[PDB]
Symmetry: D3
């Protein structure tokens, strides 16, 4: 027995936003809500009205889904996401993503706040994710497979679409800011990482560290939804600076990168219109 | 309260195969079913009739247990196994293995399809596993210990029996094919690994990567059942070639190694008769 | 809905030990019970009378909580702990630690039996833990946050208090035995580690390996309880010696370090009085 | 934590039937589907698309909700219901009824197939229920109360609305058939009643016996939805005739009363328009 | 595995009320809290601090346990109880009662608000319960038996102690008010009874009807705690008057009988001192 | 998902008793074990080896299934049964009965210890059950229906086979003892009934009262297994005598009727051979 939550969401959404077929699905992490404010003919639906959606329990996370246009592009946007640390397992973002797929989106644009594992890339930088290393226990698709959405086994080759990543490089140039590319390594949380765990992540080949992305992304590849992902660096991972880490410091430093993030997103949309 | 499933299986098996005490227990992974076809006085029992057994949900996996003689050796053979990715936890292959032990087997010969982490060893090769690194969440014996089968704590030293491994080296020589030995690293799945995860596995010391073996093997050591394990390399892990990965590609390339696998198994049996 | 077990324990404890405000909370691992015998005006309360406490299921572990004075310091002492391998998740030691906090302790002195990942440091040595790397699935605080004890997110910076660690260095000198400092890497168990997993732990930066510590420690930092931790090396991790590993050998070699452990603890208490 | 299923249904229904505020909600039992065929501008929504609705598992029961006009009255109609015997407890018909309430219905017109406990009233008769006696274990509102729909405690006085019952008496007259009024006694099922249980029901004051009605009705009174209920007598209860009971006999004899049932319903609608 | 909640409560209670061995345990239903106000040296412990106690969710019910002296008798008093309708099964009042037993009480004095099934006995009357008829599903002791408290099977003969009932008759005379004796019939609720159910209860031999008493009482007999019980008639059961039933009307009419109830309780205490 | 326990039992039983097709299945209640001692070529299988069987937890109940011949009739016999009061719901005897059906039995001969509701029939008497009245919550088949064994709905008409009951009357004559026929009313237990509940049972039409029979019997009718049932009267129900009730008194008085019970069973077998 499988979740029909995405199917119910399709119908619930037709009610608040009829004759609408979004092309891009966004997940706005901590602090990045401000972008949804600019969506054309914005219709907001609380997650409490959408079965399966991540009714927020996190600061920086709203619990709203905003549908409309942005750059004249039919877009759907999650203001707030669900994390493994909340206790509902690795499937927490799975119904939502499947909803994006059934809505007819062709890609997911995942954003998240994160720590840097490279001295070279500091707070304020934006990093395009080109791959990931999962450290959370298990994975989203563990369990009986839902044949309606994808196959039992599936490849993560080119999970972070190389083509949309090239477009992201172009937009960064055109606007005068660096857009490094890195390997994201997920961490369960909710505690931040130890300094030793961070050193282990460097050794293991990671460039960025966070508590999200992996569940959504693996879920997206399962149902054949292309993925894009960019992290807003809010600090240096633990042990890599003199700065004390907290959620308050994470919400605060996500503003140094905010304007660059908004322009990158809007420029990417212009190039795919 | 503990599982009595293996005890029930003993009795169920006496019905279909009386006065039979197998010495070797086989687990035939994806594609390797063909071997069970050559079993002497072959009696097939569907997993649906054996409490605790991995009623298949996977392509390449049958859901049959075949008992009989091979190279004149009383043998029991699993056509199909259970994996962590199916959602029933790390204990999925535990009752079955305990059944092998109560049947009186002295060793488990585990086979599995897998990806190579070494450029040197490509699709078509066979690798004898000499050890493993577990990446799946937790382990099979987590929980109350079943004193009827083994102790609370137990060693994995010489888990992949050095002696039976030497015999495997000799057989390979005697038949004209290389038999590299390697460290197996388990992965939860069902998604295949990312390229970065694969690089992390090289760094960590792994030679082979797959979604099985570890549960069965740790379960076997717990109840003092010696283990043997060989992987049929079906491809290069993610990022190590230009080849796209799928279950269809895994079932397909397990044939390049099939004849060598059959001869290795039959030659090993000959040497222990 | 949250656990009120620590609150119930406060009241249960007033009954057996009135007008008592302990400063240091101890967790005596396998073999180290002998220390609790010297507590002044020792009052023992079985874990069966304290909701949430780790009613033992492990050899070397009692299931007793001893309250009293040591070197004239109001102390509370756990004779036996709970482990992830028991099957009750990563929260197994969380209620107990919160009980220590509500009792008014200012620090946790965690002890545990462990294997060494350094040739240089053998069976009999004592190692002060300066940090850790978690390999167990998930973490203790995963799930809804209990605001009565701490915040949603929290730092592990200086988790193993640098100041109390300097005092430990001093005492060791004042008593004639090396007190190496190391990075502890947790392992789920109950099986011991494979040789390959051990090599992976060296590569990853670990110095000591065990099946406990991490749950208690992360729980302690969550509720702002300072931590101290020392491991009694009972052997070399797997593959690093010719010695066969078992719980019997772990209980046995924890005696070579016992007198040094007792003097270190008593000397540390003397310096904080 | 409470069910939001009715709220989701409101939104799902606006999609298939916009600007529609039904006044009467019908539950068509076994055999009575034929009535829904005459609904004006009939829109059918499968229960699989309505969270909480009784996805059928019973013969005679469809799993469809039909919305439209009948005798020019905005009506909503359940073709098929859920029963306690299905194993989902006494709350099985609760979300559906709450959906009727939020839709803005002012009354529920419950119909069901049933056995007679009075020799006087045989197969083919229709009986208006004036009250009930519950024999099923527990009740629908057992558990935390959902303040959004009604209060903790509530009265069943005039549960089967006396006023709408008087209208039913008039209609029956106006059409040439007797409409006896009776006390309905619920039974868990799925087995039919024993002869002794039936005698016990006579003694206890019952006139009609069945496996439904009570859950729906009590749920309706909780959220202040007026109720009407009529049973189509399909046989004499066990031990009261020579006739063998089965679901096939229940679906068959519900036709002797079908035309009278259709006219009663249509005449009642006419009088409330 | 059994509940140790009563054992924990013993210890928690010693903290708030040391060297105290109560003889009588009271359960004050809806409205009867006022009595607890006159307890000598009254110590109040919220149910949130007593594991297993009925943390209230009902109006008229506090969630406090008051210990002290009344008419100079060491007494323990529940201000508020738990009911089957709350959803935690028939065992809801079991730990509390066992706590009364371990505290050393020799009797339980259960009080409750209720409806009368006899015209003769109206709102304002007090009825001593001499026996009961259970209509709730199952019973409290269903499940594995806790040998520490009582036996597997046990008799309900003289459940409502004849001797303490004679004393109650005496006191009533000594105070000027009728004290009718009756058979109590439990009902699950939370809905009030139908008129037909009430007629069925008369037929079945009941005199009083309510939603409590039975769980507590059966639990008391199991652990050999004598019982007393008196109901404050707040109304006539459904269908027996013109009065509309609600919890507001139940809290209101429990005052007509309040002074008589207080004097009966205080006079009974006087006679057992 | 359904229970395959009966199918597993078939196979387990072939092992201990090959080429055996029993015609009659017995359930020996409390005290009646002695009969199984006389079974020809008796093979005993502990319930712990038969998935789904009532591993005993009750005095008077063994936990053994005995297969063999008796009166030269292929018979299967349960020494001990499962009851609703044990906490595993009304389905506790369902797998066992289905096992009897798959074994090929044509009838179930249910026996049980019980109390009499008729002054006329006292301790020592035997009563053939001709029907029943269920007072336990719900019924065995509640939940999804297992189509492999029977239909969703089914009749209890002639549940206690009139034909086998006539044979029972004949055998009683032929041996010189009365064999009254009565209506059995089930009670949940484990507490014995109150005197008032007993009076209610007389009023309701019952002749015998007990804590078993109903689950087994309804389960038997579901899978079309004919039923026979006889109760050994061990006492008068509560309030009908001066005798104190206990399980010890129930095991004791089941001997006054033992010889008559043995002869009745053996005579019935002779007449169906
Ligand atoms: N895990 C993790 N999440 C973050 N979010 C923002 N900064 C960080 C960080 O350093 N680590
Ligand atoms: N995890 C995993 N399993 C495999 N099975 C066959 N090839 C592979 C591979 O590359 N990875
Ligand atoms: N995990 C683990 N625990 C230990 N406890 C004592 N020695 C060891 C060891 O080598 N490994
Ligand atoms: N319970 C019950 N349901 C019915 N449905 C139709 N006839 C009957 C009957 O006699 N009893
Ligand atoms: N069940 C029930 N409880 C009550 N409490 C107060 N009055 C009543 C009544 O009439 N019925
Ligand atoms: N329920 C019940 N079971 C019994 N078993 C034996 N006697 C009795 C009795 O009186 N009542």
């Amino acid at each position: 027995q499988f979740s029909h939550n995405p199917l119910f969401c399709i119908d619930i959404i037709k009610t608040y936003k009829p004759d609408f077929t979004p092309r891009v699905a966004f997940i706005l992490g901590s602090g990045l809500g401000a972008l949804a404010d600019q969506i054309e003919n914005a219709v907001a639906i609380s997650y409490e009205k959408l079965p399966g959606f991540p009714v927020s329990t996190v600061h920086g996370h709203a619990g709203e889904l905003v549908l409309g246009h942005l750059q004249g592009v039919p877009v759907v946007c999650m203001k707030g996401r669900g994390h493994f640390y909340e206790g509902r397992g690795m499937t927490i973002m799975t119904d939502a993503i499947r909803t994006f797929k059934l809505l007819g989106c062709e890609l997911l644009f995942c954003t998240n706040a994160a720590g840097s594992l490279r001295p070279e890339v500091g707070a304020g930088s934006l990093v395009a994710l080109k791959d990931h290393i999962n450290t959370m226990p298990g994975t989203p698709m563990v369990g009986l497979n839902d044949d309606r959405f994808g196959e039992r086994f599936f490849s993560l080759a080119n999970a972070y679409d190389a083509e949309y990543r090239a477009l992201l490089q172009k937009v960064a140039k055109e606007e005068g800011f660096p857009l490094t590319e890195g390997v994201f390594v997920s961490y369960p949380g909710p505690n931040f990482e130890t300094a030793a765990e961070i050193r282990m992540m460097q050794i293991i080949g990671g460039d960025v560290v966070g508590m999200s992305v992996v569940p959504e992304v693996i879920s997206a590849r399962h149902c054949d939804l292309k993925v894009v992902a960019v992290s807003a660096i809010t600090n240096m991972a633990e042990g890599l600076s003199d700065v004390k880490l907290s959620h308050a410091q994470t919400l605060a430093a996500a503003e140094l990168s905010k304007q660059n993030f908004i322009n990158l997103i809007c420029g990417f949309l212009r190039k795919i219109a």
